[PDB]
Structures are given as C-alpha cells and as structure tokens.
Design a protein around this nucleic acid. Sequence first.
DNA 1: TACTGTTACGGCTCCATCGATGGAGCCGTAACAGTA
DNA 2: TACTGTTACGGCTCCATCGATGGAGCCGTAACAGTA
Lengths: 635, 635
Amino acid sequence: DYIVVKGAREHNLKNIDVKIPRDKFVVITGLSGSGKSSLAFDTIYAEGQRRYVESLSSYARQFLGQMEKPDVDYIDGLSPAIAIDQKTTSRNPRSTVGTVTEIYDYLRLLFARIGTPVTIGGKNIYEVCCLSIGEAKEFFANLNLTERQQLIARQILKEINARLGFLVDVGLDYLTLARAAGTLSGGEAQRIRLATQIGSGLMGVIYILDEPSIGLHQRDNDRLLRSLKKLRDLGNTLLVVEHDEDTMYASDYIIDLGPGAGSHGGQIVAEGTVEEIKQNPNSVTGEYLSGRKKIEVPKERRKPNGKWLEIIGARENNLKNINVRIPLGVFTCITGVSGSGKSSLINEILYKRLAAELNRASVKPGEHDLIKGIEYLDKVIDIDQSPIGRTPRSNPATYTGVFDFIREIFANTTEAKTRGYKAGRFSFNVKGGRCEACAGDGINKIEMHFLPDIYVPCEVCKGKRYNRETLEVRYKGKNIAEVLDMTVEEALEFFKNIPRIHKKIETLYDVGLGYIKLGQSSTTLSGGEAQRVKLATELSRKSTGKTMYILDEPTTGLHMADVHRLVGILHRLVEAGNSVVVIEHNLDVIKTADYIIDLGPEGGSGGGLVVAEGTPEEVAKVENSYTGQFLKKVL
Amino acid sequence: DYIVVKGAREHNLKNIDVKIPRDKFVVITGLSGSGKSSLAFDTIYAEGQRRYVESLSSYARQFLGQMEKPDVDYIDGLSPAIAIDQKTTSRNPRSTVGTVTEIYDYLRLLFARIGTPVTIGGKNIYEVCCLSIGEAKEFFANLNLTERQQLIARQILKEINARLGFLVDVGLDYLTLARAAGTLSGGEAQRIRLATQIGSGLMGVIYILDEPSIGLHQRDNDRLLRSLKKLRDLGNTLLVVEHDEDTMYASDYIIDLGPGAGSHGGQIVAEGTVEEIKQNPNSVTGEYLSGRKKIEVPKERRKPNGKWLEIIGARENNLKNINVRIPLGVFTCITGVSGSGKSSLINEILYKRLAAELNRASVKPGEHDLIKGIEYLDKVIDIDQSPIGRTPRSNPATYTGVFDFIREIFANTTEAKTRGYKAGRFSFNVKGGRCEACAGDGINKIEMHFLPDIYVPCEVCKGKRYNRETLEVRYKGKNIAEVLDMTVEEALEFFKNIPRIHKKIETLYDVGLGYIKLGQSSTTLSGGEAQRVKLATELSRKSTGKTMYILDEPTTGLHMADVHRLVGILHRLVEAGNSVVVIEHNLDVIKTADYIIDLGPEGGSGGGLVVAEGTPEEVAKVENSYTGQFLKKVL
DNA sequence: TACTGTTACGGCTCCATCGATGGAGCCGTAACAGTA
DNA sequence: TACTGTTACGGCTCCATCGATGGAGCCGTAACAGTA
Ligand SMILES: Nc1ncnc2c1ncn2[C@@H]1O[C@H](COP(=O)(O)OP(=O)(O)NP(=O)(O)O)[C@@H](O)[C@H]1O
Ligand SMILES: Nc1ncnc2c1ncn2[C@@H]1O[C@H](COP(=O)(O)OP(=O)(O)NP(=O)(O)O)[C@@H](O)[C@H]1O
Ligand SMILES: Nc1ncnc2c1ncn2[C@@H]1O[C@H](COP(=O)(O)OP(=O)(O)NP(=O)(O)O)[C@@H](O)[C@H]1O
Ligand SMILES: Nc1ncnc2c1ncn2[C@@H]1O[C@H](COP(=O)(O)OP(=O)(O)NP(=O)(O)O)[C@@H](O)[C@H]1O
Ligand SMILES: [Zn+2]
Ligand SMILES: [Zn+2]
C-alpha cells in the first residue's frame, strides 16, 4: 500500500523520507538538477532490480548485470518494476520499427507456429511487415482461424493486438513495420521507445517514467495521458518524472523536490494534491502553477520591418512543396504536431543553406528551389535536437571551450615559461601532466564480473588528476586543480579582468549554472544541466548584430524557471537586433513569440502544409490548427 | 504479512485457499502424493518466478526461461523466492566441490583482483583449492590485508566467509575444494546442493525447501535445523516440505494436506501448531505423531540360528580394514552418520560379491580379503540409492514389467492371430501400432521460444496413443487403451486368473499404489510414487526361500504410513525365511530391527570403524555412538 | 520345454554446464581562409 | 597581427544488439546360460 523509503542519500539527497502511495498516478516535480532522477531511477528502480536479481544464479546475475547498490537504508513494499531511461537511445540503420517494438519476433513466431506452407490470412510475412500499423491492426483483428489454430495462437495474437492497439492510440497509425527506426523524429522515437516496454500492460507492476513527453505536442500529450490512465486502471502504480502542467493536473499525488538545485537541493518541499501544491508557498513549482510568478507575455508585439526570408518549393521529406515566409528581426516560433515536418523544413533546408552561404560549409541542403533574403544575414548559429555525448573526459569547462583559454593563460605564466611547459601539459587528456597511475581519471574504477563495481580513489595523485610537478605552478595563488575545483560564480569573480574567459563564464552563469563546478564529469551531468550547457556553448559565441539563431527544442529537461530564464535571454538577444527562430512545443515560449508559423494539420504523410501563420492572436482565430485551440485558452 | 493463495487447482488440488504466514518456519506435511510439491513448488515458486521474469526484456525472458503458468486465481504478498528441487541432480566428472558451491568463482575473482604477482597470503590458487574446508576457513579468517586491499575485497571475502561457515556448520569440514562432486554420498551431495543456494543468506526472501533431509542422519538433521533457524532469524520466510518428526516439532506453523493421495487428496485437513495438529483427529500425520497409530516394535527379537556372513579385511574407500558379521535369517539394519562408510561397505563389497558368485554377474567388487558364508544363499536382490529416470515413454506398467505379459496376452487373442499381429504392435514405443501423427505420445507439446509451452491433445488418435486398426481387437471386452486406463485395483480384479500378472499387480497394490493408473507417465510421477514403484519392481521378483534383500534407503519420499507398510512387507518376507539387510536412517525402521551394525563414529576419513553391534537394546547401551543415544529416547 | 538371471544392441529422452562487434560522439592538435 | 568560422586526423569512451554438447537412464529386441 506504500513504497516507504527512509534514509536515502544517493547523489545529492539530504536523507529524505518519502511515502509513495500505490495504485495511483504519482508525479515528482522540481527544478532541474533537484534530484528527481536520483530519487526514482537511481534508488527505487535500482533497489527493486537488485533484490529481484540477487535471488538468481551466478550465470543469470552476470548476464543481466547488477546495478550499483543505492545508498538507502531500507525500502518497503517494493514490487517488480519496469523503467524507461531519460537519456535517448540511438538506433542502428539495420533496425526497423517492428524489431524495436518487438512485434517482429511475435510475427515470426506466429508464422512459424500457425502459418500454413508461411502464409496466414493469404499474406506472407513481407506483406504484413510492409504494411501500415492501422491496416495491420485491422487485418489482425478480423482474422479467421480454426479451433486448433485459435487455441495454439492465443498468447501470440493477444500481445500483437495489444501492442498495435497502443501504437494506434498514441497516434502512429501512419508508420510501416519495415520503416527504419533511426529516421523517426523526436516524438515518434519517444513513442516507439515507450511502446517497446509499456504497450503490453501487466498487473501489480510499478511503472517508472523518466520524462515520457519529449518532443510531443500538447495533443499527443493528452492522448498519452489517457493511455497512461487506462494502463493505471489495470491495477498498477505509475511514477512520472515530468515538467509539464498537464501531467501535474492529471496526477493523484504530487511530490516536490528542491528547494533549489545541485548542493542547494535534494530535499522535499511540499506534498499533496494539486491544490495542496498551489497553496504551499515554499514550492517554486506551486508558485509558478498558481500564477504568482509567470512568464510575461509582451503587451505589444514587434512587427516586421520589411525584411523577410522566403522559402519557395520546400519539398523535403513529407513537405508538399509549400511556400513559407520567415520575418527577420523578430522572435519567430514554429509550432506543429509531432511529425508534421517542421524540423525537416528548417534544420534540413534553411540552416544548411544559410551555413553553406555564410560559413562556407560543405553540407548538402534539402530539396528546395531557392531562398530569398540570405544576403540580409551575416552568420547562422544553431542548436540541434540531437542529444549530447557523455564521456568521463568531458566537463563544462572543456565543453563550452574555456579550458583552452585557461590552459593558455597557465602556460603564459613565468614559471611555466621557465620550465618549458606548453598548454598541453595542463590537460589531463594529454600525457605529460596527467598522473600516469590513474591516467588522469582522478579515481580508479574496479570492475567485477557479476558483483557491482567499486570506485576507489587514486593514491598517487590523491584525486587531483595532476602530478606534483604540474601543480607547483600557480596563477594568482591557485593551481589548475583549484581552478577546476571552483564553481561558476567563483570563476566569474576570478577571471573578471580577462574578457575572453569572462564572456563564456557569464554566458554559463546566465542560464542558471552558478552552482556547477568547472570539473564536474559529463557522465555525472543531469539531463537539464547538459541541455543548459549545450545552450550556453552556442549562446556564448559572438554576434555581429545581424545574425540568425535556430534553436531546435531547447526545453528538453528544463523547468519553468529555466525556460523563463531562456526566454528572457532570447528576448534580450532579439532586442539587440537579431532574428531568432525557435522550433518549440512548450506553450509558454510560443505565447510570447512575435510570429508563429504553423504546420500540419497532422503528422506523417498527412501533414506538411502551412495551416496558420501570423501573430499568436491571429493564429488563435484559426480552428483548423490545434495550436490555435490551445492558444485560445492560453491567451 | 501473508502469502494468501485463493483458488489453486494445479495438478490434483481441489481449489484450496491457504494463508501462509511470513517470517516464520512453516512446514507442509501430508501423505505421499497428497499434493505438497504441487502446492509449493508448482504454484508459489512458479507464480513468483513468472512475475519476476515478465518484467524483463525478451532476451532475458528467453534466456532465463519462463515456467508454466500455474492454475491459480491470484497470489498476494509474494516476494523473490529461491527454491531447491526435490529431484536429485547428477554431476559431471569434471565438476568439483568448489565449482558446484560457486566458491571457485569467488576465489578466482579474489586472486585476479587482489593477488600480488596470483599469490595472496603466501599461497597460490592450487594450494587453496587442494585444502580442507575447515583449514581454508581458518586461513581466510586470519588474513592480513592492507587498507586498499581490504577496501577492494570486501564483498568478495564476506561471501567466501559465509559459505565456508555454512559448510563447516553443516559438518563438511573434511572435504577438499578439489574433490570431485560426483563421488560424494547421498547426504554429502544433499548438503552441497543446499550450500550452493542457501549458504549466503539474503533479507526478505522466501526460501522453499523440497525435502532437504535426504540421506541425513538425525545428528546432521539437528545441525541443519539449527542452521535453518539461524537463517530464518535474518528476517526471511521458510517453507519446508518434509516428512520427519524433528522438522514438525521445530516449526512454528504446520499445514497438513490430504486426506489421502492421488485423486483422493489435494485438500487441506488441519492447520495450526504441533499441539493443534495432534489434537485434530482428521489428520493422519497428527494421529501418527500423537501415538494413536504407530509402528509396532516387536516384543521378542529373533536370534541368529548359527548362520553368519563374515566380511574380513573390508578396506573400501574410507574403511579401516574392519571385520563385520551379518547374521542370516533375521532382519538386519545398518546405521551410521552420513559419510561413515556403510554404503561403501555393503553396496560396494557384499552385494557385488554376492551377485558375482550367484547371478554370474561381471561386476568388479570392492577391496576386501574374502567373504565367508556365501554358500548359504541362493540369489541376491537389491535396491540402489540412485534415483530413477523419468521419461514420457515410461509408466508403472512398463516399469514393473507387466507390460510385456499384457502385450503377449493381447497378441495371443484369436483376432490378433488372424490379423498377423505380434506383441510389438501393441506398444506405443514401436512403429506399427502407434499413431504416427503424435508418435504414440498421445498429446502434442507445442514449444515456444520465450513464452510458456502449450499442450494440445492429438486429434487423429483422440489421445488414446493407438490407431483404429489396433484398438479393434479386444480381450475380455477391453482393448489396450482401456487396459492402460484403469487403476491398479481394477487391474487386480481384471487379471485375477492370470498368476504371472497377478503377482506383480499384487506387489504394486501392497506398497499402497491402488489408485495409480497403469499408463501414468513417469515424468508426471511423484517422488514418493516413483520410489514405491522402484521398490515394488524389485519386491515382485520370485524368492526361493533362501535369498538376501539389500535395500539402500527406501524411505526417500515416504510418509509414516508408507514406511509402516514397507516395514510390514519386510517383516513378512523375513518371517517367510529370508534375510534382509537395510541401510536406513529412519528411526522407526531401525527400532524394529532384530540386529544393528553401527559404523562411525564420524564421517569422512574420521569414520569407517564399527562402534556398536548387536540388538537395539544392546546398541542403546553404548555411549560412543549417537545412534545409541537416540535409541535411548526411542526405546 | 518353461521360468528366470545375466549380457549386448539400437533408439529415444532428460538434465548438467558453460560478451563481442559495429556505430556515434568528444577532446586535443593542426591547417586554411575570411574579417577587423 | 589577432579573432573566429570551417575542415581534417588521431585517440578514447559509451551504447545498441543479438542455446549447444556431453553424460546418464529407460524401453524394446535378441541371445546365452542355469534350474525346474
Ligand atoms: N554521479 C554523480 N556524482 C555526483 N553528483 C551527481 C552525479 N549524478 C548526478 N549528480 C548531481 O546530482 C544532482 C541531481 O541529479 P539528478 O537527480 O540527475 O537531477 P534531476 O533532478 O533529475 N534533473 P533533470 O533530469 O534535469 O530534471 C545534480 O546536481 C547532478 O549534477
Ligand atoms: N529520412 C527520412 N526519410 C523519410 N521520412 C522521414 C525521414 N525523416 C523524417 N521523416 C518523416 O517526416 C515526417 C516529419 O519528420 P520531422 O520533420 O523530423 O518531424 P518533427 O516535426 O521535428 N517532429 P518532432 O521532433 O516530434 O517535433 C515524419 O513523418 C517522419 O517520420
Ligand atoms: N504432470 C502431472 N499431471 C497429472 N498428475 C500429476 C502430474 N504431476 C503429478 N501428478 C499427480 O499429482 C499428485 C500430487 O503430486 P505431487 O504434488 O508431486 O505430490 P507430493 O505430495 O509432493 N508427493 P511426495 O513428493 O512423494 O511427497 C500425485 O497423485 C501425482 O501423481
Ligand atoms: N569414489 C570415492 N572415492 C573416494 N572417497 C569416496 C568415494 N565414494 C565415497 N567416498 C567417501 O567415502 C565416505 C563414505 O561414503 P559412503 O559410504 O558412500 O557414504 P554413506 O555412508 O552411504 N552416507 P549416506 O549416503 O549419506 O548415508 C565419504 O567420506 C565419501 O566422501
Ligand atoms: Zn593518480
Ligand atoms: Zn495421434
């Protein structure tokens, strides 16, 4: 009846005791970096999987793999749990939709066990696989089988019917089972990843969802919420780590983590229903929901000054040769249903053509006739929708690029010049200044065979990643280890007289990363922290006053406060005299835009046509687009 | 707090609802074939494993293997469960004790991760493996390790220490890790099989024990009971399916099944503590425990009539060249601690020499000088301690040997003679008279890849295993299918005028198998039913009036009523004028013997010497043997 | 001549036992080419 | 001459993905050899 956890200290949790109700829709909210993933996926799922795995043999334990033991005293009422990782998964070119969703295995088993010779229903496996999902579902539903065949193929057809029903319900009826899984959009890939594990509902099983609404429109989010409620009605428990308002409004219990991020968070601020969350002043999320603090919609929206970008004959992917006009000098946002073809337009035609024309790139653009107005811009800066890599040899300092400047400054010191030291000796990834015992890792990870891995600190370098000779040289009383061991605010105060580093450190601080350390490993970075680091890396570049920013879904893993900060930054950049084009699904960012280009009205082959275009007030008057329907309530 | 099961109909359970307390020592008792294994191992363990496996991926599900879905409505309060199968497991010659107990893997990991070059504590892996278990435990306990080494090897040494402690506690301190696992006795192999899975105790895990006291003396049973109580004190639940009195007296809760066996059982008769079980008249086990029905100890014990069998210089295995005298014409029982060397004496010297001298066998006997008194016997009949095979092409009718006579009788009919039918056409294991569609199996088993297997009956033969041509010929109004489809009592009534079949059917009925069908498959046979079938197969052979019976542990899987029936049969055979030598651990059988040969006083290299010898009253006066100490209380 | 012990000889069934390769991203280094 | 965009080139790291062989037992058939 409860999932009571007492004494949890994983990562940055400050020994919190939480009682999670069972057979409910419990949602964990909080700021980015607060510790929600460490609370759910790193503790509850880890403990459940470890308990279920320890009872198996050595072969099974070494094959499945045992997760690291969480630093939790005891957990009561645990049940077998299925969880989906927050980090997105790349797909091999050979993989298709059917193999990823595991429906291909059931199709093969059905054809092998029931197929009359390899032909069931007058069709071979090739015709079934090269078929639409809705067509396959309606063909399998109306299947005439004999008594013996129906008896044999019961648990084979039931699972296929359930999976196809879920895939139709989420809205993927236009896909084919032979289509490659790597060419799907963000929302389609997210839905496929969900359906791989949640389509066939079990009973008495805890379902852990780590941001299941990535790249999904509000209309798709409503359908997924209805599907999740239907699954929960089977008698399961759902724990959803989300940032959207709809999920909070459609949840029975809300658990809030905070009150900040990093070292300032990891606690529990408020608990209860939505009304209890709103009435609690200590909750930042509750205050934002109640409207006490909100994103300010502009009173007057800027109008184009006669400068326009014209795209003529854009027919990339599913685009039906449309003509789109993007105003220059104003904040432009593009909205559409998941799969309508907005990224396939912008990131595959406009950004590539702009880069080829201005930055002298060598990337082939999309299928289009011509673009008018390229001469009005000087350079193009873009943020892709692809995820960032995670390696132990990476950190914010070496990712945003301040590490090169810091190393050059350290090599410019008198002691380094006397000792004949270059800039490469001060990096832990090049031999010469890295402790050879631990290969500059700082710690040594001992890998077992079936037992969980154990981390032991290095003794030669004490964990400072550098030998004694390199740490001797100090700049302004600090060596490189203490340089990498201070937060962003301390680095901002330290490098205040060096503009080259100060600009990038100020950019990092602006997005809200004043608590992070310059040497924190990338593998330990949160999803929201990694997204904000990627945003700051591109926003730290110099602007010439006539530039175009192309941001593709920067809301991934960002709380309401973080997106408010990003909105403020983008508005300041626009007011400076630059043009920003944002492909967004969050209503808060769109409701402040000065221009909206709407695509749809559906996804897949059914979309690719401009439905609405103009200011948000004018777009809200169009009943054809669901974006207008949502903007009616938002405005 | 409970393991509540409602609506269980697996095998022969008549929809019983049982509430099993948690964190206790619950013991399930009942007659042989009542349905205890079907209640615990086929339902609770199956449901728990299925629930824990369904949450994994397709690869994991197909690798681990999903057990058949039990026919149970719902089970509440299940947790991860570890169970040990009742059926014994043979061991390959290459396997040793360390590899079977999984301590070799931990030794290899310790030597690879901590060993200084492959040498920890001044010894290589060869010296550690070629060492006594007690010596290895005391060497590992007093291990001097540095700070880093102790930090690294914590969960490696803890498991080794726990496993060696359990192996010392059970009483296997005389074994070596390099000793082959196939050469151990029954009790040693049982203890090794236990230690493989129960040595390292977990928390909040259900432990299911399926007869864990096979081939164990009472002294070893007490030690194992103390170890089980220590493990249960860790906060686990133990469900023990046993037949001994000590386990019932040392259990918190007792659940009694019955009231009979086969189709007459599968119910629940009484529940509560030991006093509640005794006070309930409906429980056969309770009545036997309370002394209302008990095995009658003879008032006067027969004395030898001057006929003796002398074994001189028996030095097989661990025997220290002892001289043993076995009286002839009386019921002789041999008692000793597990591993003392009683089977290695009898079954390896006496039986082999008797078979070679009388039955003209070609089996090499053990290491001994000579045997005096072989000329006093005519033939030797023995029952080994090895388990019986289980194949779908086997049944009691074809195992006890009545199938050959039945087939000859069927081929002797007028219709068979007219049709040119031989005896082979009436067997389902030979082409010609079996349904070729199912190859005589009767049912077809469809095998999936990861899903549980589904059994579908054959349609060509309707499940009668024979075609239409063979079923036409009927003997006394019954064809071969109806012959195989009647119980043992019906066969006894049917074949009452044919002594050749009547003798074997009466032998089968005597041991208490009047409910079994002649065509029931061996794979579906219970352990006790298989043991009784094996006993009847050898007891059905003709006796010449001067014969020797050598029964090696016939109590395996037999209830008190079954062993009472066997004791009566053996006493009648002895009174007929034959000599019976029984290697036994059950006190009920020994307490009625007319002569006892005691071996010990310990196991392994510490035993092999005759401690006591004579009538049970005289043996009970010896304080050196634990058998005398137990007979003091028994008598 | 029949019953009963052993053996062989063929066929069927059950059960124990034991991570690597390709694709993608990131960091450090070098080089080339525009702007300022 | 400095800042900044692009490219290449080598090295390190992370993540997706996909049951068989030998040993033992049992059943049906045939043969050989003692007892009765
Ligand atoms: N391995 C680690 N070692 C140390 N700190 C870590 C590690 N992993 C994460 N952290 C920090 O722990 C805090 C909480 O991380 P995490 O629980 O992943 O955040 P989160 O609330 O789920 N954020 P987000 O996913 O963006 O919503 C952050 O400050 C992380 O930087
Ligand atoms: N390489 C490709 N070949 C064929 N079809 C494609 C390809 N890439 C994308 N598509 C399809 O084109 C449509 C639009 O894709 P895309 O424009 O990437 O989506 P999107 O608008 O960014 N959706 P989302 O990321 O969910 O916001 C979808 O039906 C995709 O399945
Ligand atoms: N697969 C099966 N199909 C049909 N009947 C079966 C099957 N397996 C077992 N049985 C019968 O079900 C009854 C109970 O079997 P089981 O539950 O194994 O007995 P048990 O009480 O554990 N006996 P024992 O192990 O000797 O103590 C017996 O009459 C068996 O012959
Ligand atoms: N082939 C063998 N080689 C060496 N030692 C052996 C062998 N077989 C058995 N032993 C040992 O000889 C001792 C007696 O074995 P054995 O006589 O078979 O035991 P037992 O008395 O029948 N015990 P149990 O079956 O438990 O009642 C034990 O220490 C065994 O480990
Ligand atoms: Zn080091
Ligand atoms: Zn058939």
